[PDB]
């Protein structure tokens, strides 16, 4: 599930008028357009910070798994953080950041820049490890009050009771159940690495934002009925009396290009916000408890879930 | 505009978001007050503006054991509001 | 019962104070008011822009100019102002969509939290949901969620099963606990120990498959009264 998109900032004066001081005087008498565009884009940028905070800051403490990793036969090694790697990401997490991925310097010179997120990748990985450690040592109790420890095999006996299977079935098949879970976890790593389009829902988020910016840059070579598409050429070739009817077309034309981009950006943020709202609900109900809703947390009878962090999104293992 | 920051003796700090002038960088950690960016926040604290790295939360460690459980002996009725 | 009625009433008494003292508790609803007024001020204030014309007043343009040169000057004004109204209506459609989504969530919470009891985690409050109460606010609604939160936990030693007579017994609706000397069976969410009998436990299998079984005695209610 995607959770956020790139936060962009646009310099209204520089994009429209470039380095012309003559255009800057004339842009003042066109109203408060650049004030509106900044206000709209700032609202999108702040909302992106809230989406990540809403989804990942579900817990108020930072839990840790005990030094000995033995939970009744279940491995969990592929999801717990890796101390050897400096990034402190799990093997599945490190694999995800590779799957999802001058032009930047050219865009910066037109007034298009990108603000960095408030929560770095290190902070978001710590939320996922705190959530993962809580749900292993406690169950669903850390999501409704103080975290009360319980042995993992006894926790799984509770989770079978929630789907209509009695406790004895787990205890008399504990070794079989552990091996099936370990094998299923291992196959998830291999199947994910081989396919490059598996992480396609977040590449589209990255592609659309970069593609829309490129079209905005290429819009600067249009003429809009003017003699030329260069502000300096028009001002160095015609008298100020008659140059006004030419510069007006370019200023209005480039104002339309800026307004269109913001309108499309506002619509996309609405879609992303809906996706982030769903991701936050799934964390509350699949990860912090056991869900009885059909096909909400995976296909089958839900037992538990584990979150992983990914660039601009989240991945649930149901 | 004509205004200038001293840039010297004003505790210039270097962040991934940019250059922050006029705030001292402490080594403590507090809850975020004013977001600067890339994990840096700012707040007004004792007669100065300080910049720090925001803390996710209080550290905790559930005492996981092999045959140990924890059961409550009391409860509380809590009323919260949603707007 | 008497203690529970007291805790509820103290919780209610703090809500009257919490909203009154905190200034930004109703920030979500005040945002609806502010965005509407700010849009209308911008629409009104945008009437002074010349949009490249000589002035922003239509009457002055017509009185000081000949008709064929007046139409050129006012065309910029009419086109400029038509653009302002189109942008204003477009923003309204986007805002109305966001409000409708919040209205749909409020209608759902009313049906589920207020008209019933919800098992979904964190949907109705932080904790185990009990019931909810609605209150009407300007351009919105306010829910008071009543939740049950455990407190004052204790350490215990636990076992998955109890072995007796070569048969494995599992709890029916509780968990086996021990304070150090004796073994009890208690409900999970509250400490209420009881003697392990054949009424609150069921037998399944023998005493070697389960990893972690414990020898104890499972009291039989039928036997002692029969001997009387
Ligand atoms: C949990 O699974 C991982 C891999 O899924 C196991 O790591 C393997 O360990 C063996 C022996 O140390 C190595 O030969 C393999 O190369 C390791 N695999 C990887 C991918 O590094 C790990 O042993 C499992 N945990 C336990 C307790 O057995
Ligand atoms: C239940 O038992 C565990 C096992 O000792 C307790 O865990 C330790 O408690 C002491 C008491 O102050 C702490 O200093 C240690 O840091 C705890 N260990 C860990 C790994 O966190 C636990 O405290 C006991 N339960 C309660 C409510 O005290
Ligand atoms: C559970 O908590 C309640 C209060 O939270 C305890 O009730 C207290 O009882 C003592 C004496 O019986 C008195 O101070 C009051 O009646 C209660 N306190 C308050 C502040 O009202 C109750 O005893 C606790 N139960 C257990 C088993 O610890
Ligand atoms: C564990 O619980 C049992 C049952 O409550 C305790 O046994 C009682 O201990 C008290 C202490 O004086 C005696 O008065 C009772 O006669 C005991 N019950 C019976 C049936 O003999 C036991 O003491 C508890 N363990 C600990 C360490 O306190
Ligand atoms: C207490 O923990 C130890 C290890 O920390 C558990 O010992 C393992 O038990 C399984 C179950 O038969 C064996 O397959 C392993 O060979 C044992 N050793 C290890 C290193 O895993 C022990 O089972 C735990 N106690 C309980 C009651 O579960
Ligand atoms: C629980 O009871 C069983 C009896 O069914 C015990 O098993 C016996 O253990 C002794 C050793 O102490 C052996 O010599 C016997 O042959 C075992 N079988 C029988 C039928 O007595 C078992 O040891 C008990 N649990 C514990 C922890 O001692």
Distance CA A34, CA A14 (A): 11
Among A54, A295, A289, CA closest to C128 = A289
C-alpha of C103 from chain center: 15
Strand partners, C168: C163
Strands B13-14 and A313-317: unpaired
Residue B78 has its nearest CB partner, among C4, C147, C155, at: C147
Q: Distances from the Cα of C25 to the Cαs of A109, A116, C17, in angstroms?
A: 42, 29, 11
The H or E element containing residue A58 is none
Strand partners, C102: none
Strands C214-215 and C162-164: parallel
Q: Distances from the Cα of C75 to the Cαs of A257, A301, C161, in angstroms?
A: 21, 67, 88
Cβ distance A125 to A89 under 8 Å? yes
Strand partners, A258: none
State whether the beta carbon of C179 lies less than 6 angstroms from ligand 4.
Answer: yes
Q: Which two tokens stand for residue A96?
A: 């995800």
Distance CA A23, CA B66 (A): 75
Strands C183-186 and C201-206: unpaired
Distance CA A181, CA A75 (A): 9
Q: Quote the minimal CA–CA distance from A271 to chain B in Å.
A: 22
Among A215, A223, A229, A212, CA closest to A18 = A229
Other CB atoms within 10 A of residue A84 CB:
6
Angle ∠(C161,C165,C166) on CA atoms, nearest 5: 65
SS3 of chain C: CHHHHHHHHHHHHHHHHHHHHCHHHHHHHHHHHHHHHHHHHHHHHCCCCCCCCCCCCHHHHHHHCCHHHHHHHHHHHHHHHHHHHHHHHHHHHHHHHHHHHHHHHHHHHHHHHHCCCCCCCCCCCCCEEEEEEEEEECCEEEEEEEEEEEEEEEEEEEECCEEECCEEEEECCCEEEECCCCEEEECCCCCCCECCECCCEEEEEECCCCCCCEECCCECCHHHHHCC
Q: Quote the minimal CA–CA distance from C88 to chain B in Å.
A: 27
Please name the residues in contact with A210: beta carbons below 8 A apart, sequence gap of 6 or more. Answer: A6
Distance CA A251, CA A17 (A): 8
Distance CA B53, CA B56 (A): 10
Cβ distance C164 to C155 under 8 Å? no
Terminal-residue alpha carbon distance, chain A: 13
State whether the beta carbon of B63 lies less than 6 angstroms from ligand 2.
Answer: yes
CB contact under 8 A, B79 and C25: no
Residues of A with Cβ-Cβ distance to B71 under 8 angstroms: 148
Angle ∠(B51,B57,B58) on CA atoms, nearest 5: 115
The H or E element containing residue A269 is helix A240-282
C-alpha of C154 from chain center: 29
The set of protein residues with a Cβ atom below 6 angstroms from ligand 1 is A 75, 77-78, 186
Give the SS3 label for residue A240. Answer: helix
Q: Which two tokens stand for residue A55?
A: 């989804």
Q: Which two tokens stand for residue C172?
A: 């029916």
Kindly compute the dihedral angle of the four CA atoms of residues A214, A218, A219, A224, in this order, to the nearest 10 degrees: -170
CB contact under 8 A, A149 and B65: yes
Cβ distance A131 to A316 under 8 Å? no
Among A224, A258, A269, A231, CA closest to A34 = A258
Cβ distance B64 to A149 under 8 Å? yes
Quote the ligand 4 centre to C183 CA distance (angstroms). Answer: 11
Distance CA C184, CA C191 (A): 10
Distance CA A181, CA A188 (A): 11
Distance CA B16, CA B37 (A): 8
Other CB atoms within 10 A of residue C102 CB:
13
Give the SS3 label for residue A288. Answer: coil
Among A209, A202, A45, A63, CA closest to A118 = A45
Distance CA C182, CA C176 (A): 11
Other CB atoms within 10 A of residue A287 CB:
25
Strands C162-164 and C167-171: antiparallel
Give the SS3 label for residue A131. Answer: helix
Give the relative orientation of helices C67-109 and C27-45 as an angle to the nearest 10 degrees. Answer: 170
| DSSP secondary structure code for residue B21 in this structure | -
Other CB atoms within 10 A of residue A245 CB:
12
Angle ∠(A139,C144,C112) on CA atoms, nearest 5: 65
Residues of A with Cβ-Cβ distance to B38 under 8 angstroms: 116-118, 120
Terminal-residue alpha carbon distance, chain B: 43
Q: Which two tokens stand for residue C218?
A: 């499972």
State whether the beta carbon of A154 lies less than 6 angstroms from ligand 5.
Answer: no
| DSSP secondary structure code for residue A143 in this structure | G
| DSSP secondary structure code for residue A286 in this structure | I
A46 to chain B: nearest residue by CA? B35
CB contact under 8 A, B78 and C191: no
Distance CA A130, CA A136 (A): 10
Q: Tokens 């982030």 — which residue?
A: A276
Q: Distances from the Cα of C207 to the Cαs of A93, C170, C213, C218, in angstroms?
A: 42, 11, 7, 14
Phi, psi values for residue C213, rounded to 5°: -70, 155
Q: Which two tokens stand for residue C63?
A: 């009185």
Other CB atoms within 10 A of residue A50 CB:
13
Strands A112-115 and A306-310: unpaired
Among C200, C196, C199, CA closest to C163 = C196
Q: Tokens 């036969």 — which residue?
A: A73
What is the resolution of the experimental data for this entry, in Å? 3.0
Among B37, B4, C98, C117, CA closest to A277 = C98
Number of residues assigned to chain B? 83
Q: Quote the minimal CA–CA distance from C226 to chain A in Å.
A: 31
Number of residues assigned to chain A? 318
B64 to chain C: nearest residue by CA? C155
Strands C183-186 and C175-178: antiparallel
Q: Distances from the Cα of C139 to the Cαs of C31, C104, C143, in angstroms?
A: 11, 14, 14
């Amino acid at each position: 599930l995607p959770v956020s998109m790139t936060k962009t900032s646009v310099d209204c004066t520089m994009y429209i008028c470039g380095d012309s001081t003559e255009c800057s005087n004339l842009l003042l008498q066109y109203g408060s357009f650049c004030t509106q565009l900044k206000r709209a884009l700032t609202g999108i940028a702040v909302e992106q910070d809230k989406n990540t905070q809403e989804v990942f800051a579900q817990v108020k403490q930072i839990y840790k798994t005990p030094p000995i990793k033995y939970f009744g036969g279940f491995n969990f090694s592929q999801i717990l953080p890796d101390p050897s790697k400096p990034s402190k990401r799990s093997p599945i997490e490190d694999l995800l950041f590779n799957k999802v991925t001058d032009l930047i310097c050219a865009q910066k010179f037109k007034g298009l820049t990108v603000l960095p997120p408030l929560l770095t990748d290190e902070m978001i990985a710590q939320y996922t490890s705190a959530l993962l450690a809580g749900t292993i040592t406690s169950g669903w109790t850390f999501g409704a009050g103080p975290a009360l420890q319980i042995p993992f095999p006894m926790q799984m006996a509770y989770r079978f009771n929630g789907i209509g299977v009695t406790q004895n079935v787990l205890y008399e098949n504990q070794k079989l159940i552990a091996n099936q879970f370990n094998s299923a976890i291992g196959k998830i790593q291999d199947s994910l690495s081989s396919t490059p389009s598996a992480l396609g829902k977040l590449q589209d988020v990255v592609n659309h934002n970069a593609q829309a910016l490129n079209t905005l840059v290429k819009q600067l070579s249009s003429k809009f009925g003017a003699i030329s598409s260069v502000l300096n050429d028009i001002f160095s070739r015609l008298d100020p009396p008659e140059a006004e009817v030419q510069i007006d077309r370019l200023i209005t034309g480039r104002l339309q290009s800026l307004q269109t981009y913001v309108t499309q950006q506002l619509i996309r943020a609405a879609e992303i916000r809906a996706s982030a709202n769903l991701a936050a609900t799934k964390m509350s109900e699949c990860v912090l408890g056991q869900s009885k809703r059909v096909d909400f947390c995976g296909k089958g009878y839900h037992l538990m879930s584990f979150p992983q962090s990914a660039p601009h999104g989240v991945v649930f293992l149901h | 505009p004509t205004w200038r920051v001293y840039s010297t003796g004003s505790n210039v700090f270097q962040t991934r978001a940019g250059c922050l002038i006029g705030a001292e960088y402490v080594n403590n950690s507090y809850e975020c007050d004013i977001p600067i960016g890339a994990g840096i926040c700012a707040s007004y604290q004792t007669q100065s503006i300080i910049a720090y790295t925001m803390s996710l939360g209080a550290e905790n460690s559930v005492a996981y054991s092999n045959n140990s459980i924890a059961i409550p002996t009391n409860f509380t009725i809590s009323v919260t509001t949603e707007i | 019962q008497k203690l529970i009625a007291n805790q509820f009433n103290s919780a209610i008494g703090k809500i009257q104070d919490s909203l009154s003292s905190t200034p930004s508790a109703l920030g979500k609803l005040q945002d609806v008011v502010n965005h509407n007024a700010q849009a209308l001020n911008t629409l009104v204030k945008q009437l002074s822009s010349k949009f490249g014309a000589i002035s922003s007043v239509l009457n002055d343009i017509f009185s000081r100019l000949d008709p064929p040169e007046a139409e050129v000057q006012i065309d910029r004004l009419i086109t400029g102002r038509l653009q302002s109204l189109q942008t204003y209506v477009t923003q309204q459609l986007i805002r109305a969509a966001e409000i409708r989504a919040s209205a749909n969530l409020a209608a759902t919470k009313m049906s589920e939290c207020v008209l019933g009891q919800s098992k979904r985690v964190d949907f109705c409050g932080k904790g185990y949901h009990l019931m909810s109460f609605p209150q009407s606010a300007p351009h919105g609604v306010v829910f008071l969620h009543v939740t049950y939160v455990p407190a004052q936990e204790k350490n215990f030693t636990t076992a998955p099963a109890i072995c007796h007579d070569g048969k494995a017994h599992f709890p029916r609706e509780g968990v086996f606990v021990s304070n150090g000397t004796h073994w009890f069976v208690t409900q999970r969410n509250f400490y209420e120990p009881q003697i392990i009998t054949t009424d609150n436990t069921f037998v399944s299998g023998n005493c070697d498959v389960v990893i972690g079984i414990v020898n104890n005695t499972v009291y039989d209610p039928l036997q002692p009264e029969l001997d009387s």
